[PDB]
Amino acid sequence: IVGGYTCGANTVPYQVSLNSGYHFCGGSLINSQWVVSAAHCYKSGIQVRLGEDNINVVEGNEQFISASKSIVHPSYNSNTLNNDIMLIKLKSAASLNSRVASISLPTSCASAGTQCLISGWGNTKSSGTSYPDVLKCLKAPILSDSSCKSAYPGQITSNMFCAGYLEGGKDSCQGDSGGPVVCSGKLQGIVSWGSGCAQKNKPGVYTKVCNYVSWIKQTIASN
Amino acid sequence: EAEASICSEPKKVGRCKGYFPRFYFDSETGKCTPFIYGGCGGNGNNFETLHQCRAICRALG
């Protein structure tokens, strides 16, 4: 997260870290046994880390749970990033508490101008190496479909939205992928892609979660 | 024998926002160098280990 702020320990209890010997992507807990992330974050033998703040220091209150299943959307395209969504089933249900809690799925899509919360342990600068210990947060508005398409000609599908700032300086970045965009207490977006980070007229692009609620429900119901 | 053309390709993080530690041959400094790849749309100048990079593209500087 570039241009954001320190969230505060466990203030985003649905935020998880995906770990392959190191943090490589974020995710969102949507119920006690299922996590939503990005399809490009697919790996085998993922360990999900819940209740984390400082990813580099053992606090004692974290939960580490192995993934039992990882299911990417059947229409995911790694070239266009259309349908960049994945579900991870936890080997066992997480213990729910003040530090580990599920985020609700939307019944309707969010509108342009809605302020959302974007979070993660990604790069905090637009060049070089500036990775945080603790979870970072950014308040960012959903941008109009028209401005999103103008920023990224021929690249925005009906399953994507832009959020952030056209002036630059405030964005998600490498390490944030798979993480939450939460608006009015609902998971509306997944950190997906952008042209660099926090660049002028290049806002972050996010998977449109409202389009996947039915698919999520059926996937959980069949696995 | 001339090295593969991949040694002349630029570093490409790509558009995705994952954290994938990789290596690339930097044709400006002349050395295999760590970088953070985003997870999609990379080119051939992108290796999982330092040795794998060096095997294809030896140090010039």
Curated annotation (Swiss-Prot), chain A:
UniProt enzyme class: hydrolase
EC number: 3.4.21.4
Entry's transmembrane regions: none
Reaction(s) this enzyme catalyzes, per UniProt: Preferential cleavage: Arg-|-Xaa, Lys-|-Xaa
Keywords: Calcium, Digestion, Disulfide bond, Hydrolase, Metal-binding, Protease, Secreted, Serine protease, Signal, Zymogen
Cofactor entry: Ca(2+)
Chief localization: secreted
The Peptidase S1 domain, residue ranges: 1-221
Origin superkingdom: Eukaryota
Keyword Electron transport among record annotations: no
Binding locations of substrate: 171-172, 174-175, 177
Cofactor note: Binds 1 Ca(2+) ion per subunit.
GO biological process per UniProt: digestion; proteolysis
Gene Ontology MF, one: serpin family protein binding
Active site, renumbered: 40, 84, 177
Record-stated family: Belongs to the peptidase S1 family.
Name of the protein: Serine protease 1
Species of origin: Bos taurus (Bovine)
Swiss-Prot record, chain B:
SMART domains recorded: KU (SM00131)
Family assignment from sequence similarity: Belongs to the venom Kunitz-type family. Sea anemone type 2 potassium channel toxin subfamily.
Position of the signal peptide: none
Coiled-coil spans in chain: none
Keywords: Aspartic protease inhibitor, Disulfide bond, Nematocyst, Protease inhibitor, Secreted, Serine protease inhibitor
Positions of the BPTI/Kunitz inhibitor domain: 7-57
PROSITE patterns for the chain: BPTI_KUNITZ_1 (PS00280), BPTI_KUNITZ_2 (PS50279)
Xref: CDD domains: Kunitz_SHPI (cd22618)
Keyword Transferase: no
Protein name: PI-stichotoxin-She2a
Location of the protein in the cell: Secreted; Nematocyst
GO cellular component, one term: extracellular space
Residues carrying the site annotation Reactive bond for trypsin: 17-18
Protein's job: Active against serine, cysteine, and aspartic proteases. Can bind vertebrate trypsin and chymotrypsin.
Top-level taxon of the source organism: Eukaryota
InterPro entries: Kunitz_BPTI (IPR002223), Kunitz_BPTI_sf (IPR036880), Prtase_inh_Kunz-CS (IPR020901), TFPI/VKTCI-like (IPR050098)
GO molecular function, one term: serine-type endopeptidase inhibitor activity
Disulfide bond residue pairs: 7-57, 16-40, 32-53
